Amino acid sequence: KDWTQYVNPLMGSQSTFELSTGNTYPAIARPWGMNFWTPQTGKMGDGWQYTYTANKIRGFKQTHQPSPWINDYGQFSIMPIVGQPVFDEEKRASWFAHKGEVATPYYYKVYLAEHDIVTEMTPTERAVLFRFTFPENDHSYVVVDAFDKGSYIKIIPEENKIIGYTTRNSGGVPENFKNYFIIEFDKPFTYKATVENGNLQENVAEQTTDHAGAIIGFKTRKGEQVNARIASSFISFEQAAANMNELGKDNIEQLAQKGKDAWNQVLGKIEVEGGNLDQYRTFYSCLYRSLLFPRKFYELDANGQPIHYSPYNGQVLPGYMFTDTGFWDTFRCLFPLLNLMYPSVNKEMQEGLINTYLESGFFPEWASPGHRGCMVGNNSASILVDAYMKGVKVDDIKTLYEGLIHGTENVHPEVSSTGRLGYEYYNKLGYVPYDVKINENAARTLEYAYDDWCIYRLAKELKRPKKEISLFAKRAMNYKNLFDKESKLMRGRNEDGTFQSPFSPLKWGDAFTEGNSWHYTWSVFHDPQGLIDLMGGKEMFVTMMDSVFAVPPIFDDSYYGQVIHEIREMTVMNMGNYAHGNQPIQHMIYLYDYAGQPWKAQYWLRQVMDRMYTPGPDGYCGDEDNGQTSAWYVFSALGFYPVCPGTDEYVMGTPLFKKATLHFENGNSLVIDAPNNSTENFYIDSMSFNGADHTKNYLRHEDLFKGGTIKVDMSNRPNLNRGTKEEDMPYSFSKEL
Numbered sequence: 001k002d003w004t005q006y007v008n009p010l011m012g013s014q015s016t017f018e019l020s021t022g023n024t025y026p027a028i029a030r031p032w033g034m035n036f037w038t039p040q041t042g043k044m045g046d047g048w049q050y051t052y053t054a055n056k057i058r059g060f061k062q063t064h065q066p067s068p069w070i071n072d073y074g075q076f077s078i079m080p081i082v083g084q085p086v087f088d089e090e091k092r093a094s095w096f097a098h099k100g101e102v103a104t105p106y107y108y109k110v111y112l113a114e115h116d117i118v119t120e121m122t123p124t125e126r127a128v129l130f131r132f133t134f135p136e137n138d139h140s141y142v143v144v145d146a147f148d149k150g151s152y153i154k155i156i157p158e159e160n161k162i163i164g165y166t167t168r169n170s171g172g173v174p175e176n177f178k179n180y181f182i183i184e185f186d187k188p189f190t191y192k193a194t195v196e197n198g199n200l201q202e203n204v205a206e207q208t209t210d211h212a213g214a215i216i217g218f219k220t221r222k223g224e225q226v227n228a229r230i231a232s233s234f235i236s237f238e239q240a241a242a243n244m245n246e247l248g249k250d251n252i253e254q255l256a257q258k259g260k261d262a263w264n265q266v267l268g269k270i271e272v273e274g275g276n277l278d279q280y281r282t283f284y285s286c287l288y289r290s291l292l293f294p295r296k297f298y299e300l301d302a303n304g305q306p307i308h309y310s311p312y313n314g315q316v317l318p319g320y321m322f323t324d325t326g327f328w329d330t331f332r333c334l335f336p337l338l339n340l341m342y343p344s345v346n347k348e349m350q351e352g353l354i355n356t357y358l359e360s361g362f363f364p365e366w367a368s369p370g371h372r373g374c375m376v377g378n379n380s381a382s383i384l385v386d387a388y389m390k391g392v393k394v395d396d397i398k399t400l401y402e403g404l405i406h407g408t409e410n411v412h413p414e415v416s417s418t419g420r421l422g423y424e425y426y427n428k429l430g431y432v433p434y435d436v437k438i439n440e441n442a443a444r445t446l447e448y449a450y451d452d453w454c455i456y457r458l459a460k461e462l463k464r465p466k467k468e469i470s471l472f473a474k475r476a477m478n479y480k481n482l483f484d485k486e487s488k489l490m491r492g493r494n495e496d497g498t499f500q501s502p503f504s505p506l507k508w509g510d511a512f513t514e515g516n517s518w519h520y521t522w523s524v525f526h527d528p529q530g531l532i533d534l535m536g537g538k539e540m541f542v543t544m545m546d547s548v549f550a551v552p553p554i555f556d557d558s559y560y561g562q563v564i565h566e567i568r569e570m571t572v573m574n575m576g577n578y579a580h581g582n583q584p585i586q587h588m589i590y591l592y593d594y595a596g597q598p599w600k601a602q603y604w605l606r607q608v609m610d611r612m613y614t615p616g617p618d619g620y621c622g623d624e625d626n627g628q629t630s631a632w633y634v635f636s637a638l639g640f641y642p643v644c645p646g647t648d649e650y651v652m653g654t655p656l657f658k659k660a661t662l663h664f665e666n667g668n669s670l671v672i673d674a675p676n677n678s679t680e681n682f683y684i685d686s687m688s689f690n691g692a693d694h695t696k697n698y699l700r701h702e703d704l705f706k707g708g709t710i711k712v713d714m715s716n717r718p719n720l721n722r723g724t725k726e727e728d729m730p731y732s733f734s735k736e737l
């Protein structure tokens with residue numbers, strides 16, 4: 001059975017600075033691959049390295065880039081050409097068309113119209129095989145570009161080989177950072193030249209300069225194929241050479257089949273039926289996007305043991321390491337998806353985080369490849385605790401716990417999003433103030449409270465001393481400190497204790513991150529009942545929620561000085577202020593379940609699934625964010641969502657397919673049957689779980705892991721009685737206390 005046929009790596013490529021439809025590039029790679037490969041249409045340095053509307057390809061590039069904002073590192077490219085040997089990135093570029101392009105996760109092909117050359121590529125985890133099909137020509141070449149900001153290249157003719165290293169990065173690297181690469185051709189060089197600051201030097205073997213490059217060449221007959229075996233390493237040339245062996249002796253067809261098998265192995269863990277082709281394509285493209293980041297950042301030594309270059313301290317050390325993810329995005333449902341369907345993989349990732357802490361002094365928040373300043377919160381605590389509570393346990397729980405405590409009272413001296421910016425005010429006053437020069441203060445406060453609840457959960461589980469447990473139980477309630485009774489919204493609060501004025505609910509940024517108060521007010525994952533109480537009860541709560549959808553999308557952008565794409569994305573979708581591409585609001589619709597109106601969530605979730613995701617190049621409604629926006633769809637299409645990682649609960653939505661089957665790593669399977677599902681029947685009239693009536697608005701992780709059958713009776717009218725009782729409600733902290 002093949003699922004790769006539904007994956008579109010182009011989904012999200014039709015994006016611009018002004019309006020994101022995903023901001024993705026076609027990642028031709030193995031799952032979680034250390035090195036990704038992509039056609040490059042953008043100029044060197046530009047975060048928009050591949051765009052759907054672009055006319056020309058200027059290289060095939062090794063990339064590690066998680067997003068256009070964060071940008072890239074460990075990057076170099078290769079380009080076949082004919083005619084004059086040219087290195088210039090504009091001069092070597094070739095028109096192409098998407099009808100002359102085939103992109104799959106395991107295999108990429110394109111016809112380059114200006115050189116009359118076909119390029120195919122098939123990667124493994126750290127290596128890749130290229131096959132160039134040349135026209136008849138006395139002057140055919142391959143350009144190797146090591147990129148600028150300091151690089152190295154050397155041609156070795158007696159091995160049909162080029163080696164080099166690239167260093168161009170976007171920050172977050174140690175001073176000795178280098179990516180070492182090796183390229184082996186199956187055809188002898190009849191022409192050879194290295195390049196130095198734009199200058200072509202024939203028969204000069206080596207360059208160590210700002211922007212190194214090489215061009216090798218030969219005569220070709222019509223349709224003649226030249227294969228190039230490539231691998232790189234963050235450790236050394238010798239390790240790069242060892243990484244090369246992932247290719248074995250395979251040709252393009254054999255490596256493509258191995259990558260296809262590898263993708264079907266992970267995609268096939270979730271089988272959906274009874275939908276249309278749009279839905280299959282959206283679902284598996286999203287699942288594909290959910291299995292890329294964080295990437296592996298470790299390599300295998302001669303004994304088959306994991307070692308890694310440390311992007312934190314620049315040493316080479318034993319053990320796992322992963323990178324290129326921002327937890328501010330991915331704590332929400334991406335990592336939870338790993339804990340449900342790919343726990344053995346997240347196990348390696350958690351071990352990697354322990355090593356991050358040991359190597360750097362801090363758990364990461366945004367890492368790429370080392371600590372990077374972007375976004376807010378201490379949501380690493382959610383990642384670590386959710387894994388642990390779900391049976392994904394690192395060996396070194398002492399270091400895990402100490403690292404968490406450390407993160408609650410330090411901030412990284414160079415990277416203000418690593419650790420807790422404002423921890424002194426927060427620990428003392430119960431919030432980060434609005435007038436002490438700490439931007440996004442309300443967003444930090446809300447996420448810290450949830451983060452502190454996660455720590456509370458683990459402290460309690462570990463039976464820490466009662467006063468530790470009590471400290472975090474108290475801090476978990478810190479969200480109350482920003483609640484403004486008058487507006488029923490979260491509000492920036494001055495150091496003296498007065499709420500800030502004038503208060504502007506529609507103002508983006510400033511007190512909040514990537515949105516306004518209407519977006520952030522719902523960020524109380526661990527205590528929705530507490531928020532409902534704050535608002536004066538479930539009826540007023542629902543009224544506030546309903547108004548999010550019903551109001552105009554007016555906004556105040558003074559904080560940014562322009563209509564940033566996130567604001568524009570909200571305005572065009574016609575869902576009031578519900579900006580689905582904004583991460584803070586992505587769990588919000590599920591909160592209708594905690595107020596006793598799950599039918600409202602059923603309505604709105606199907607609206608989002610039907611309207612905010614399409615399978616084309618412009619497929620997302622905003623940034624894909626390293627699996628978060630994709631895993632949202634994967635979960636939601638199945639019919640449930642981890643509103644609160646750190647609990648064992650998935651809050652019920654409404655399934656998209658007639659049947660979904662989950663194959664867990666433990667050998668059990670869960671079948672979700674919704675035979676009467678359709679475009680019109682999106683309400684849950686009733687539900688059963690292994691024969692037992694199920695009226696609760698949540699499923700438990702442990703129950704799912706035992707496997708069996710859920711039966712969902714779909715209907716075109718809401719059931720106003722189902723899931724309204726107190727015993728039907730998912731977890732809230734104030735109910736436990």
Ligand SMILES: CO[C@H]1O[C@H](CO)[C@@H](O)[C@H](O)[C@@H]1S[C@H]1O[C@H](CO)[C@@H](O)[C@H](O)[C@@H]1O
Pocket residue numbers: 066067068069070326328329374375564565566583623625
């Ligand atoms: C610097 O760009 C960031 O901020 C500007 C606003 O100042 C945003 O408009 C832009 O989208 C990004 S935030 C963007 O990128 C982050 C890193 O990839 C990601 O974590 C976040 O969710 C968002 O997608």
